[PDB]
Amino acid sequence: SQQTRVLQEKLRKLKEAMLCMVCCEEEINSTFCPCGHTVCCESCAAQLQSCPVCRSRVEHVQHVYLPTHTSLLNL
Amino acid sequence: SQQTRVLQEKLRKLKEAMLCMVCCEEEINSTFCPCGHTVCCESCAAQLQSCPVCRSRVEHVQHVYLPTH
Numbered sequence A: 001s002q003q004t005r006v007l008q009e010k011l012r013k014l015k016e017a018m019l020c021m022v023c024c025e026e027e028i029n030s031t032f033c034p035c036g037h038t039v040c041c042e043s044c045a046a047q048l049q050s051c052p053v054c055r056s057r058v059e060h061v062q063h064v065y066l067p068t069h070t071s072l073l074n075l
Numbered sequence B: 001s002q003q004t005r006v007l008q009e010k011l012r013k014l015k016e017a018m019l020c021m022v023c024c025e026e027e028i029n030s031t032f033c034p035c036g037h038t039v040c041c042e043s044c045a046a047q048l049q050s051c052p053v054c055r056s057r058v059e060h061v062q063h064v065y066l067p068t069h
């Protein structure tokens, strides 16, 4: 039904929000510290000197284990 | 249709996976450091001296800003 199409769109958008903002392919699993923006995969977060969202200096990256993780790289 | 019920269940499970594993009421937004387990809201994370997933000592809690929030 049309309701099935609406639910498919909601699911698709939530899943896309869990993907890296730089490569759009891998799941987000890294946090820029101390600002806390958690928007990148490990590879894309590796060489950024400043946060791509707030411009704060990246003192270090913290790996995060989230219950939503489903990609082979995070299992 | 039956597919509408299947999609509602998938959406419910994904939304429940974003909620605190301790209180089940607030969104996950905190990481236990240095282990990295990100399973609690800030109120439950503040009250735990040991990670509830791996039992490692919590050296500090890092707030996380996630695009799914």
Ligand SMILES: N[C@H]1CCN(S(=O)(=O)c2ccccc2)C1
Pocket (backbone or CB within 6 Å): A065, A066, A067, A068, A069, A074, A075, B037, B038, B039, B053
């Ligand atoms: N990749 C996995 C490894 C652990 N994380 S988790 O989010 O800490 C977690 C812990 C226990 C139950 C459900 C989720 C997910």
Ligand SMILES: N[C@H]1CCN(S(=O)(=O)c2ccccc2)C1
Pocket (backbone or CB within 6 Å): B033, B034, B059, B060
């Ligand atoms: N050697 C450091 C590297 C980061 N970790 S930490 O647990 O994130 C941490 C950071 C700041 C204060 C207290 C704990 C310990």
Ligand SMILES: N[C@H]1CCN(S(=O)(=O)c2ccccc2)C1
Pocket (backbone or CB within 6 Å): A037, A038, A039, A053, B065, B066, B067, B068, B069
């Ligand atoms: N539209 C994206 C751009 C980056 N943000 S964010 O860093 O995930 C964030 C999450 C919660 C509050 C404020 C910011 C979402």
Ligand SMILES: [Zn+2]
Pocket (backbone or CB within 6 Å): A020, A021, A022, A023, A024, A025, A026, A040, A041, A042, A043, A044, A045
């Ligand atoms: Zn990436």
Ligand SMILES: [Zn+2]
Pocket (backbone or CB within 6 Å): A032, A035, A036, A037, A051, A052, A053, A054, A055, A056
């Ligand atoms: Zn930032």
Ligand SMILES: [Zn+2]
Pocket (backbone or CB within 6 Å): B020, B021, B022, B023, B024, B025, B026, B040, B041, B042, B043, B044, B045
């Ligand atoms: Zn909680």
Ligand SMILES: [Zn+2]
Pocket (backbone or CB within 6 Å): B032, B035, B036, B037, B051, B052, B053, B054, B055, B056
């Ligand atoms: Zn842990």
